[PDB]
DNA sequence: TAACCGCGTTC
DNA sequence: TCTTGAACGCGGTTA
């Protein structure tokens, strides 16, 4: 019935594709040799596939197909279409009566079925499926996806009927119908365009020849084509102290760039002084000359925009958050001028509210920043991404001064708008475009979806490609039960124990200062007898070389034990430290690949016993955690019996809500607790013989990442080799390092999402057991590593796969082998001595792999890809301490390089989005001062100097700060994940600020989720909770009669005329906050390091006073 | 004071 | 509709 709507949509897409140079190309005819080795002979048209979309065509109801958008070698563009029948399978219980089902479904689905056929597939959840047994299914094929749905609609009813007890009519009777044989439907929830891309092995970014036989990969061409790339950014008028609205506000300026060339278009109706050609080259690598069009009115701006789009024919349009600001604004402003943007440039919102087009992919760079840039949310704004990635500080302009600068400073506005463009285009070209289009060559998705989809969904696709190419039947998406019980107690949450985190030592540790070490002798003993096989291991495994080919093996073997000797008899020494960090590379991946860990490889003793019941078993343990009400099962009945009369004028999911609520109070009433958390150590069997398509997929992507990681390591040294005198060489080498580090980091979230996918909702390969084993194993490796560095040094902090430590300046350090050829083989004893212990204790000797598929012969061997990598030595490492006795602070510290630059700053308020600007600016000013001072006491003093400097300001009640600089240093800018309406009954500074932002300015302030709550804490009302004294810092720039009235009720002081900022601030609250930061970063850690409180203006807590005088 | 929540980091 | 995980810090309220 809705077909016509789908047929109509496709049609219009063709007209637009034609309007942008995409004519549907049908290739010539040919009857001869198909083999790809004859590509030049076969007739057709080669092209670089840039984009693909599902569609509906008629013979010349629609028949499903996929449009394929190409850029040919001769500088042209063309479209081509493959047709593929949508299809899903039917499973059966008794595989003897498959034909009865086949006949039944043929007559039942006569309305929608086109064809049908028995097929066989591998099923990894079947007994003796490894010995060669296949799964029989019925392949339902259809003309289009619409009819495939109608089937699922006509089959799901049966599926529910076979799951409900059959209502017999005769009680006394003592054959089975064909409907009762349908077990399930399978591979039914696969996107059609994805289905075609997998089944025909077509990928975006690959070179193909389009022939009558089909598509052929011209693997001779490896380099991408160069599509026309445009990035654009808009500028809007905006109510003072409010947000832009497409209903009233106008576009004033639109900057954009097209393949290196820069353009600006201005609305003279708002921009007064006409703008002319100028140049913004932020850095030499980022050229950007700009020509300007000064259109008269706003519709001439939109018209000039659409006209130019059609001119250059762009296959890629890049923005920064254009999906939810730029595009929807241009759409409404075109609508309010009676302009159909679909009719004009073929863009429209899809079912997610994002703006896509057929001929052109919309590359919202923000999507990449959120997912792949590996940047914190406090840096995912255009300015920070421009600084972190492009490397230049962009032009900034206060949004409240963009509307008036149309009159006042129109030049300053034009530079800021082209600033947004330059940063957007060169961000896309240098970073996004290579990563996205190259990822498209292995992921069966077009660029639009490769950029936006969740990383878990990406892993799914990759895995779907393997499972299909190995004829493995896809498991359906996982579903969680609505309730779940344990020991009679209802479960709230069950999970597993994640990574092992440890804060051990706090305070300052510096290269120029000195530290005490208590060396375990018996650990030096353990290291000296582990010495021989480790040194062979370092060259044989870590460097993959022969012992008898390296020269100075014995030369090193003694120099290390010499220091091991001088450190053995002198097991108590006070020297300088060496600050090092050790990290296992791709830990959870390498833990999975090493152990053949994958969801299907996990079995009970029930099933693998039914196979070859023996190295099928790598018995591995994981730690289960459940959170459950203390109510026993009998208590549950009472609540179930009681809760039956809630409302009158209920779905199961709705009915669960009330059961939970009443169960909290009943559980809290008698056991004096609401949640019980129990650790149940568990065990799982992972068969070493299962089809390893999952774990191999993880290994492919891991190796995919190692290339870029190894290439960054390679170009690091190239910089070291080039003398400081040659700039260009160094500069280019720096440019290479930045490129390769981004590439390896962008692959990281996908590689780790392979371990995350096993817990994702709707996952096809769900295993809590697998995830737990991965996590636990790793905690055991890092704790085993800690136990050793404890014995030979002082480890400072530890997190999952990482260890921060200081080592005696004389512990064995680094050593360079000399190969007989004339090569230098690197050796770092500290890292390599750890690696051995892992290989001797965490190596899979049951790793079986299929050698002979015909005779089903497996060959056990030994696998271990778990390697520590070492970074260092560092000059300083500042770790904080808790305010509570004994407690420490994890996931938070600062490190400094040999040359003093900030190595790593982790976890602190400075990096996070929001938080109090005081602390951020304080933290950004102090950490660099722990590098000052000539001893731990002189160090903590230079810190205290700038500590008192910041303290002075607070006690000075802001007298030293200009009002403008004052608020920009006292404001807290927390964000709201949702709209206000959804935090009902909760209390926070963000909720109050939002609630007060609304009355002060309007309900249209809190309409959208993601509100920036910029607030300041007031003194009045006195002795009232802090969530109630949150003042919007916007009121302090509002009208004086608006200001007063609100500030009076917010303070509950109806007779207050003093509106000056400094009288309202509760400096006491700010002093406490700044006080805790001083305690945690300076004074307390000093006390645990034996220094006296170096900032005596901030006291110690009671317990820590009582412990200096023990 | 311990339990608990939202945000946003570190893995 | 989509949709990687757990561990942790911190200000702040809740029992
Ligand atoms: N975003 C994430 N999602 C899921 N698991 C993650 C994520 N980040 C880290 N992990 C887990 C899996 C990692 O192997 C483990 C150690 O973190 P980390 O060392 O940063 O990554 P890694 O060891 O995979 O990569 P690298 O080679 O860069 O060290 O923590
Ligand atoms: Ca790691």
Numbering used by the authors: 31 to 90, 112 to 225, 232 to 670, 675 to 710, 726 to 1186
Question: What did the paper state?
Answer:
The Saccharomyces cerevisiae B-family replicative DNA polymerases, namely Pol ϵ, Pol δ and Pol α, have been estimated to incorporate about 13 000 NTPs during each cell cycle of the yeast genome, and Pol ϵ seems to incorporate the majority of NTPs, roughly four times as many ribonucleotides as Pol δ. Other examples where an amino acid adjacent to the steric gate residue influences ribonucleotide discrimination are found among B-family polymerases. It was first shown in the ϕ29 DNA polymerase that B-family polymerases have a conserved tyrosine (Y645 in Pol ϵ) that functions as a steric gate. Our data show that Pol ϵ discriminates NTPs through the concerted action of a steric gate residue (Y645) and a sensor in the finger domain (N828). A comparison with other B-family DNA polymerases showed that both Y645 and N828 are structurally conserved residues, thus reinforcing their functional importance.
To test the hypothesis that steric hindrance does not allow the finger domain to adopt a completely closed conformation when a ribonucleotide is bound to the active site, we replaced N828 with a valine, which is both less bulky and unable to form a hydrogen bond with the β-phosphate of the incoming nucleotide. Compared to both the wild-type Pol2CORE-dATP and N828VPol2CORE-dATP structures, the presence of a ribonucleotide in the N828VPol2CORE structure did not induce any significant structural changes to the residues surrounding the ribonucleotide. The activity of N828VPol ϵ was comparable to wild-type Pol ϵ and M644GPol ϵ. Biochemical and genetic studies showed that the N828VPol ϵ variant has an increased propensity to incorporate NTPs, suggesting that N828 functions as a sensor for discriminating against ribonucleotides.
